Design a protein around this ligand. Structure first.
Ligand SMILES: OC[C@H]1O[C@H](O[C@H]2[C@H](O)[C@@H](O)[C@@H](O[C@H]3[C@H](O)[C@@H](O)[C@@H](O[C@H]4[C@H](O)[C@@H](O)[C@@H](O[C@H]5[C@H](O)[C@@H](O)[C@H](O)O[C@@H]5CO)O[C@@H]4CO)O[C@@H]3CO)O[C@@H]2CO)[C@H](O)[C@@H](O)[C@@H]1O
Ligand SMILES: OC[C@H]1O[C@H](O[C@H]2[C@H](O)[C@@H](O)[C@@H](O[C@H]3[C@H](O)[C@@H](O)[C@@H](O)O[C@@H]3CO)O[C@@H]2CO)[C@H](O)[C@@H](O)[C@@H]1O
Ligand SMILES: [Ca+2]
Length: 761
């Protein structure tokens, strides 16, 4: 998978088009007023453009008809054409649908009568009907929900303070146990529902209330731009991630209550974002400018062979692996992408972007995009995949006359340090190769996978292993995303400890260890939505068009893995409390002291971090143990000999779990230790405001434990639900319960004992 600079008649032509016709004007699309509406289409290849007006978005709908057709005239400046077609219809034209008929040549046959006519929606569509075939004239202020003018961006001071929850809108609430109303399940409006509980039983929180409690800073949403792969008129059981773009600046219709009325999806999309903002959560949008679903697109139908990268042979370059790739190096696609980003930020109050196959997008465009978004607010986050999905064929230079560079990991040094790149280094290091679900990483016991973790600990910004980030700010730290297998599915497949979606005590230990690594590592901490509750896709390693009920978040898991949720919740608090871990720059690189060589093949990774921030802990000690037995780990750094443990295999948080004197720590099997200096802990005054519930499993006759006790942890006053241990053999059954199996967290710890007796199933 490589990139190749090849100049040819298509690239030659497109460059000449940019020289003459490039339009920096800021009014492409509809310019609606109550008095009149002006339409504008950029097409230097066209000989004529007609405007077609309709009553409805599709012909099937009630009262569907065509109002009239009009002819656009060339926009002349001092009797010179600037490449833009225009027309102004005087009167009220809101809530009417429209589409252009573009008679045009290709880029390499301008001036000839080798023309074709295509019917297409507006390239700069702000709204469309069902299945995005017809554009809609809309007053955008009519789509504003209640108090939208009072809705601000939710931005982090530092991107490296984030905790990203990568979520699909359908997956969020499609499960009936979500407790979300019948109308809104798997829809935009699901986010607006406060007070949702598991099976609406009013005992444990789900959806938005669950996120408030978990304490995630950021929700990254899978494509909610308009895509092809769901029929918006069809059945509700349809599923797709939606990496199949059609209209870039239009919400997806499937996630709305009514896709036929183009305004409805816009309103409900804003209500989703307002809800997340009101919950104090930042919203990142997954964007896919790297390709469109088909070359039968609004871009091609307007200006054929301009917007896509063309090979010498006339074939579309297939760098995406999806049939085409967007020519970001072109003047009017660069501008489109940058204008698109600004639109979503300004109109929909989007706080950041995850760029799909950023490696197919040229570095200059990305830095220009960073600079443009900086003008709004530099806290607006940017990150993406620093790779392609195939071979890419591009021109030597951009439309600026600077050399084309793809925004890959290899070219991280040429890319803004506030455009982060997914660190597959630490990903593969933690839980094994993402390309093979059965492959083992560090947590399953791979010693050679340790170096991947150790380099990931400093966001692959200290030394070089596979790739190098400029700083932690340019690194997304993660163990799994929507692609490939979930963390827990890979744990299961690679070990064979149980079936997919089945709880196993050793698997959970490995899951907890992954948590400890992610939140004692530098960079932008990132997880798949439900990693904290051992999310499973039943071994599906590419669930892009798999069943909806397979993909959906199983909300029963907030109870079944409540202890795992509690662990992540605590680990998150540790990172947010300790500044070195959330550093943007390389200030703390030389403050790390690894016990063993960073590249060591080892069962036990350990290091200390010297802090310099007053009012915080002075020094943190982190140990990862992947051995099946407990290990005594002696730190090479002996400067501190008085420690307070704030994380172990049982729990993580801001509270003391015991003290250690000296430089040696006994680390349990398949577990992490996080400790901080005694003096620092005492002075800083960083303490937990969360309650705890200890769950025990005892054989009543002997009084002996059948399974290790676990810890739940949550806000004082918030509801918890405990359950019997799923892994205890079927020859025992619960006979009696001590303490409150269900209740609210208190400041003082509560205990729940499940008393077991002999059983024969
Ligand atoms: O045949 C005529 C037709 O050809 C082109 O378009 C074709 C492609 O050539 C075909 O390959 C096919 O495309 C399929 C893929 O084959 C199929 O794998 C799938 O792609 C999925 C991935 O499976 C899925 O993993 C996901 O990948 C995402 C990642 O999740 C995301 O993290 C990352 O950022 O982005 C990648 C994708 O780049 O999503 C993709 C896409 O949904 O589905 C596609 C689409 O069906 O079929 C198309 C369409 O026929 C020409 O483009 C077209 O003009 C011509 O008519
Ligand atoms: O193409 C995008 C892709 O890039 C990265 O994948 C690389 C892997 O990290 C690397 O191991 C290797 O993958 C090989 C598999 O391990 C092996 O099982 C077999 O399938 O051959 C593969 C060679 O292609 O190479 C790829 C890069 O080509 C990144 O980690 C992925 O997330 C991403 O999808
Ligand atoms: Ca759609």
């Amino acid at each position: 998978s490589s990139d190749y600079a090849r100049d040819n008649s298509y690239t030659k032509a497109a460059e000449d088009i940019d020289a003459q016709y490039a339009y920096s004007g800021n009014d492409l699309g509809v310019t609606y007023t109550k008095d009149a509406t002006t339409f504008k289409v950029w097409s230097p290849t066209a000989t004529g453009v007609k405007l077609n007006i309709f009553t409805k978005g599709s012909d099937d709908e009630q009262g569907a008809s065509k109002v009239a057709s009009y002819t656009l005239e060339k926009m002349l400046v001092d009797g010179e054409w600037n490449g833009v077609w225009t027309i102004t219809l005087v009167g009220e034209w809101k809530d009417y649908y429209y589409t252009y008929s573009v008679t045009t040549t290709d880029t390499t046959h301008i001036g000839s009568d080798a023309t074709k006519t295509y019917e297409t929606q507006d390239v700069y569509s702000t709204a469309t009907g069902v299945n995005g075939k017809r554009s809609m004239i809309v007053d955008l202020d009519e789509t504003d929900p209640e108090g939208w003018s009072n809705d601000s961006h939710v931005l982090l001071d530092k991107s490296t303070k984030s905790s990203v929850w990568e979520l699909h809108i359908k997956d969020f609430s499609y499960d009936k146990a979500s407790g979300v109303s019948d109308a809104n399940r798997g829809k935009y409006l699901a986010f607006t529902e406060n007070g949702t509980t598991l099976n609406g039983e009013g005992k444990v929180s789900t959806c938005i209330d669950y996120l408030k409690e978990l304490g995630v800073t950021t929700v990254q949403l899978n494509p909610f731009y308009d895509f092809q792969s769901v029929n918006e008129a069809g059945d509700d059981s349809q599923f797709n991630w939606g990496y199949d773009p059609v209209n870039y600046n239009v919400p997806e219709g499937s996630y709305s209550s009514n896709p036929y009325d183009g305004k409805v999806r816009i309103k409900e999309c804003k209500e989703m974002i307002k809800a997340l903002h009101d919950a104090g959560i930042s919203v990142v949008m997954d964007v896919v400018y790297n390709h469109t679903y088909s070359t039968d697109s609004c871009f091609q139908y307007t200006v054929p062979n301009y917007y896509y990268r063309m090979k010498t042979t006339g074939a579309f370059s297939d760098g995406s692996g999806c049939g085409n790739e967007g020519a970001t190096e072109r003047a009017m696609y660069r501008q489109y992408v940058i204008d698109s980003l600004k639109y979503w930020v300004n109109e929909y109050h989007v706080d950041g972007f995850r760029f799909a196959l950023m490696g197919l997008m040229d570095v200059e465009t990305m830095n220009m995009a960073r600079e443009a978004l900086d003008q709004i607010d530099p806290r607006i986050t940017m990150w993406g995949e620093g790779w392609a999905g195939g071979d890419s064929y591009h021109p030597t230079n951009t439309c600026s006359g600077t050399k084309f560079y793809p925004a890959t990991q290899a070219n991280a040094s040429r890319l803004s340090d506030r455009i982060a790149i997914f660190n597959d280094g630490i990903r593969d290091g933690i839980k094994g190769s993402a390309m093979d679900i059965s492959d083992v990483g560090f947590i399953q016991g791979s010693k050679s996978s340790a170096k991947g973790v150790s380099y990931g600990v400093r966001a692959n910004s200290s030394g070089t292993y596979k790739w190098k980030a400029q700083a932690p700010s340019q690194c997304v730290t993660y163990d799994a995303c929507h692609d490939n297998a979930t963390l827990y599915d890979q744990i299961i497949a690679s070990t064979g400890l149980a079936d997919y979606g089945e709880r196993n005590s050793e698997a959970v230990k490995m899951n907890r260890l992954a948590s400890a690594i992610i939140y004692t590592s530098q960079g932008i901490s990132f997880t798949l939505a439900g990693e904290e509750m051992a999310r499973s896709k039943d071994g599906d390693t590419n669930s892009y068009k798999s069943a909806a009920n397979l993909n959906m978040i199983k909300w029963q898991n907030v109870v079944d893995y409540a202890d795992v949720v509690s662990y992540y919740k605590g680990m998150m608090q540790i990172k947010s409390a300790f500044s070195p871990l959330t550093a943007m720059d390389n200030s703390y690189a030389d403050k790390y002291t690894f016990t063993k060589k960073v590249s060591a093949s080892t069962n036990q990774i350990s290091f200390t971090i010297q802090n310099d921030v007053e009012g915080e802990w002075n020094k943190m000690a982190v140990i990862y143990n992947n051995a099946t037995t407990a290990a005594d780990v002696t730190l090479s750094d002996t400067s501190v000999t008085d420690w307070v443990v704030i994380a172990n295999g049982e729990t993580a948080g801001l509270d003391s779990l015991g003290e250690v004197t000296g430089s040696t720590f006994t680390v349990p099997a398949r577990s992490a230790i996080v400790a901080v200096d005694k003096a620092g802990y005492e002075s800083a005054g960083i303490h937990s405001s969360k309650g705890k519930v200890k769950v025990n499993y005892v054989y009543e006759a002997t009084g002996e434990k059948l399974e290790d006790s676990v810890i739940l942890q949550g806000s004082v006053g918030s509801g918890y639900v405990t359950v019997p241990s799923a892994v205890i053999p079927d020859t025992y059954i619960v006979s009696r319960i001590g303490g409150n199996a269900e209740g609210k967290y208190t400041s003082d710890m509560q205990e729940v004992t499940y008393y077991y007796t002999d059983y024969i199933p």
